[PDB]
Homo-oligomer: A and B are copies of this chain.
Amino acid sequence: MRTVSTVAELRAALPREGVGFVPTMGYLHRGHLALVERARRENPFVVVSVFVNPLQFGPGEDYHRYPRDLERDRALLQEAGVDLLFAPGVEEMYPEGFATRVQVEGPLTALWEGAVRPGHFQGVATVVARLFLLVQPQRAYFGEKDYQQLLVVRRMVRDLGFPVEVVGVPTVREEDGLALSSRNVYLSPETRKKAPVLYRALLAMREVAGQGGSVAEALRAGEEALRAVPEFRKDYLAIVHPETLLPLSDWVAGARGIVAGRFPEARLIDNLEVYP
């Protein structure tokens, strides 16, 4: 695996065909590797980027606190069979004079995570657009854990016409169900025990949906699950349309349950298909 940190070397190290791409912010875990394997198996050349993007971190968030361990990532990727690792510095990605932004507007970015993290999706859209242009991938892989982000990237791709196939990969979970996330390291031993509540709430809703319950009844079951863990401050809990993320008035194939909230030392999010 060749490691590069500049745009110049990146472009020269890239073939024009069969590129599978996996954008990440470093401090990789079992979950990221699932994306890399998927990419490795489907494309002759695999590229993974590691870059903590300042643009998607807003006021009051964890930019400087974000987990960083390049050598650990470089060793993990090298072993995963990745051909190219792009680990640029902030000034390589955003040199002096940088002033362009890409943003998906409307309900897709105004609701849920967009309401809790204003400006977050503009930062994501901007860095993804740039990465797609620098890498020119045939396929790009994203985790379903960040479902809204996945839809935002798909919308930007469809709207602007990027010739990139965006692939969503199922969420990797711990035995107790806690979705893997680099931010889980924030959790203390005690909070980690309560963390499974998000997935628990989501399962409660899927259960009602399977028993023939209404959307409203499913939401109630989910609310109750969360209420049992007051330490968890809920941001939102809903059952939304799989493509528009609008609250559902009735069930539709692919109905998505989404939840988010925060414990004192960290914020967590999760989602799951509740119907059928």
Contacts and interface: CB of A to CB of B under 8 A. Distances in A.
Given A130-B159, A160-B130, A102 B102 contact: yes
A155 B99 CA distance: 8
A248 interface: no
A76 B136 CA distance: 34
Contacts of A211: none
Contacts of A99: 104-106, 108, 155, 159
A101 interface: yes
Max count, chain B CB within 10 A of own CB: residue among A16, A136, A155, A159: A159
Interface residues of A, number: 28
A98 B105 CA distance: 9
A125 B160 CA distance: 11
A251 interface: no
A7 interface: yes
Interface in A120-160: 125, 129-130, 133-134, 136, 155-156, 158-160
Given A129-B160, A159-B130, A101 B103 contact: yes
Interface in A39-66: none
Given A99-B155, A100-B155, A134 B105 contact: no
Nearest to A101: B103
Contacts of A161: 7, 130, 133-134
Interface pairs A-B: 10 shortest CB-CB:
A100-B159, A133-B161, A99-B106, A134-B161, A99-B105, A100-B104, A100-B156, A130-B160, A98-B159, A102-B102
7 contacts: A100-B102, A100-B105, A100-B159, A101-B103, A102-B129, A133-B161, A136-B163
Interface of A: 7, 11, 16, 97-106, 108, 125, 129-130, 133-134, 136, 155-156, 158-163
